A = this chain, B = another copy of it.
């Protein structure tokens, strides 16, 4: 069980940091034949749910992450129509739609260019993208309760929410 691996890598504090999380996820086999997650992707995964700002992730938060990772993995396989093991612009656009985001062509362009390596978006980068989209949206939503699609941010708040990710 992935939960058994969590316990095995948790260490003395019963919670995982980026490095421990990377070990747990790699042992889980969630990445299949794709490359394991990078330390950076695991760090952002933690930042996404680090409500207490401790740089670590508790088990209950991990259950939420695991659920999200499996949904994102299915989306990846769904949109990877050519089975390249990489997500191209039109595929990523589809995945973004599957996740519920309504983004402009330019934003999509920016995202593809930012996450591409040698021309392609591999699983690790794809997941990192999904994580950041969710983390940034969580922050934005706290300033957009009416869900109007706009929000005011004081500079300091803006940096706190974005620099933490």
Contact = CB atoms under 8 A, between A and B. Distances in A.
A150 B152 contact: yes
A156 B107 contact: yes
B159 A109 contact: no
Given A40-B40, A55-B116, A110 B152 contact: no
Contacts of A103: 155-156, 159-160
Contact of A152 (B55, B151, B163): B151
Contact of A160 (B55, B104, B160, B163): B104
A3 to B, nearest CB: 25
A155 B103 CA distance: 8
Interface string A139-165: 010001000011111111011101110
Interface centre among A129, A144, A153 (most CB of B within 10 A): A153
Interface stretch (A46-54, A64-72, A73-81, A82-90): A46-54
Nearest to A163: B111
Given A150-B154, A151-B155, A132 B163 contact: yes
A133 interface: yes
A114 interface: yes
Interface centre among A47, A129, A144, A159 (most CB of B within 10 A): A159
9 contacts: A47-B114, A53-B106, A53-B113, A55-B114, A110-B160, A136-B159, A140-B158, A144-B155, A152-B153
Interface of A: 17, 40, 43, 47, 50, 53-55, 101-104, 106-107, 109-111, 113-114, 116, 118, 129, 132-133, 136-137, 140, 144, 149-156, 158-160, 162-164
